[PDB]
Amino acid sequence: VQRLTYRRRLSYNTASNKTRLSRTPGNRIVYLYTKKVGKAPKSACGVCPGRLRGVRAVRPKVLMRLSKTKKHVSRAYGGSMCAKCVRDRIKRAFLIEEQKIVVKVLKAQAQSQK
């Protein structure tokens, strides 16, 4: 069985020295150095443990090359906040504003009464 060596001068099995096995057209197994696994962006709400959909999970500096379409989704707060969180924000904002209007009307009635 063929045994293989590192192709660089870094002999220590660190995070940056991760490899994988590949078969060349020369019928010999060599080491190919792999890029680190990317992570999808997390929601800005901070309550949802899952990661956001519709965005490629690549290294942060790879996003510079990636097109705008792959880096976000076609929604408000797209690519930074989840759809459920955005819907909750919309409902919360509408309800709070309506409650403020009701409170203001009640306070105006109180002012008129006295």
Contact 36, 59 (CB under 8 A): yes
Which one, 38 or 50, has the nearer CB to another protein?
50
Contact 111, 103 (CB under 8 A): no
Contact 32, 19 (CB under 8 A): yes
Contacts of another protein in 31-90 (CB under 8 A): 47-49
Which one, 9 or 114, has the nearer CB to RNA?
9
Burial 29-51 (b: 16+ CB within 10 A, else e): eebeeeeeeeeebebeeeeeeee
Interaction between residue 68 and RNA (CB under 7 A): yes
Q: Counting Cβ atoms within 10 Å, is residue 4 exposed (0-12), middle (13-18) or buried (19+)?
A: exposed
Q: Give the long-range contacts of residues 65-68, CB within 8 A, separation 24 or more.
A: none
Among 45, 71, 88, 89, binds Zn ion (CB under 5 A): 45
Among 55, 58, 73, 82, binds Zn ion (CB under 5 A): 82
Which one, 68 or 114, has the nearer CB to RNA?
68
Interaction between residue 71 and RNA (CB under 7 A): yes
In angstroms, give the least distance from the CB of 42 to another protein.
Answer: 13
Binding site for another protein (CB under 8 A): 47-49
Binding site for Zn ion (CB under 5 A): 43, 45, 48, 82, 85
